[PDB]
Amino acid sequence: SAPHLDDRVLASLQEVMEDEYPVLLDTFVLDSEERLRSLHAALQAGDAQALRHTAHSFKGGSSNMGAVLLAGYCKELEESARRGELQRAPALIEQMEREFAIVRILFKQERQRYR
Amino acid sequence: SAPHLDDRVLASLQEVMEDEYPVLLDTFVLDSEERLRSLHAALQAGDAQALRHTAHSFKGGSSNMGAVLLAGYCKELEESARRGELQRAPALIEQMEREFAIVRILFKQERQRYR
Amino acid sequence: SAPHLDDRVLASLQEVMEDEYPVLLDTFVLDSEERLRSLHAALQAGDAQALRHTAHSFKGGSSNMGAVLLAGYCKELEESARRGELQRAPALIEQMEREFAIVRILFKQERQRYR
């Protein structure tokens, strides 16, 4: 569902990947759960460069899977961590967890349609 | 306290239930905690059916105990779940956690008035 | 920094404290975390007087370290708890967790500037 998922991106991806598509949804969830775990760890440690790195990785994985609002927040975190501006990091991690839970349920529902 | 609790639902329940009333405050809290744990488990499984049927009971339990804002969220989650419109489920669950925490402390305050 | 930290309260404190300044950043984090844990335990017990007493301490400790928005939420909790008005307690505790998370990462950033 828009505006959380850009059907543009995912319609093309499903068409190419065929039975790999359900594996990409499952993998996206696992890889994003590990990214969020890494961001919380980086936030507690006050590790700006780890926040920036992981944010940038997450931005790309989000964009690959048409999770465009999630990739937006990842970009914000990457750019502010790059400035050393960390005030917003807790609230952006929160925004990422609330947006990621939408994408996760949408992916778990779409996954159910496949064997 | 309005708008969280409808004092006239509760005043009627007090008058009817007499000595049972404090026991109902206590079991509303434990029952609702369990219903929230089951909604989280249902959301992490992507089980729209388990979301729908836990939301509908919590709606009634909330209604029964004059928690009318909490009941209005449960109603929204039940309907969402029945339709399969899961994009709102994470946000509605969090709204039901923040509104239940209000009801919980009001009911713990009220329970202190009884042996 | 602003509006979360009043930099001049802190500029005066580091001028006075010199070498002890980084210890105070560390201490403030640990003191504040234990007081949040105390607030949550008081909220789950429906203990208005524990909420009021811990809220008052935290207001002072926040104020001493230029965390003026955090101290504002603590003041709101102290005043409402004294009046036995506990309907806003859950929300105010959550506002103090989100604001504290900002002060925490800014203090962990600054602490890395010292041995």
Author numbering:
A (entry chain C), B (entry chain B), C (entry chain A): 2 to 116
Task: Share the article's original sentences.
In Pseudomonas aeruginosa, an important opportunistic pathogen that causes numerous acute and chronic infections, the hybrid two-component system (TCS) regulates the swarming ability and biofilm formation with a multistep phospho­relay, and consists of hybrid-sensor histidine kinase (HK), histidine-containing phospho­transfer protein (Hpt) and response regulator (RR). HptB, the target protein in this work, is closely related to biofilm formation, which could increase drug resistance and protect the cell from pinocytosis by the host. According to previous studies, after the sensor proteins PA1611, PA1976 and PA2824 are auto­phospho­rylated, the phospho­ryl group is transferred to HptB and subsequently to the downstream RR protein PA3346 as illustrated in Fig. 1. In this work, two crystal structures of HptB and the receiver domain of HK PA1611 (PA1611REC) of P. aeruginosa have been determined in order to elucidate their interactions for the transfer of the phospho­ryl group. The HptB–PA1611REC complex is further modeled to analyze the binding surface and interactions between the two proteins.
Then, we successfully crystallized the native HptB in another tetragonal space group, P43212, with six protein molecules in one asymmetric unit. The crystal structure of native HptB was subsequently determined with the mutant HptB structure as an initial model and refined to high resolution (1.58 Å). The structural differences between mutant and native HptB are small, with an RMSD of 0.15 Å. The structures of six native HptBs in one asymmetric unit are essentially the same, with a small RMSD of 0.16 Å overall for the Cα atoms [Fig. 3(b)]. The structure of HptB comprises five α-helices and folds into an elongated α-helical bundle with an up-and-down topology. The helices α2 (Tyr22–Gln45), α3 (Ala49–Asn65), α4 (Val69–Arg83) and α5 (Ala90–Arg112) are twisted around the central axis and form an antiparallel four-helix bundle. Residues Ala46–Asp48, Met66–Ala68 and Arg84–Arg89 form short turns between helices α2–α3, α3–α4 and α4–α5, respectively. The four-helix bundle is covered with the short N-terminal helix α1 (Asp8–Met18) which protrudes into the solvent environment and connects to helix α2 with a 310 helix (Glu19–Glu21) [Fig. 3(c)]. In HptB, this conserved histidine residue, His57, is located near the middle of helix α3. The imidazole side chain of His57 protrudes from the bundle and is exposed to solvent [Figs. 3(c) and 3(d)]. The hydrogen-bonding linkages between Lys60 and Glu79 prohibit their side chains from shielding the imidazole ring of the active-site histidine. High solvent accessibility of the imidazole ring is achieved through the nearby small side-chain volume, which results from the highly conserved glycine residue (Gly61 in HptB) at position +4 from the active-site histidine.
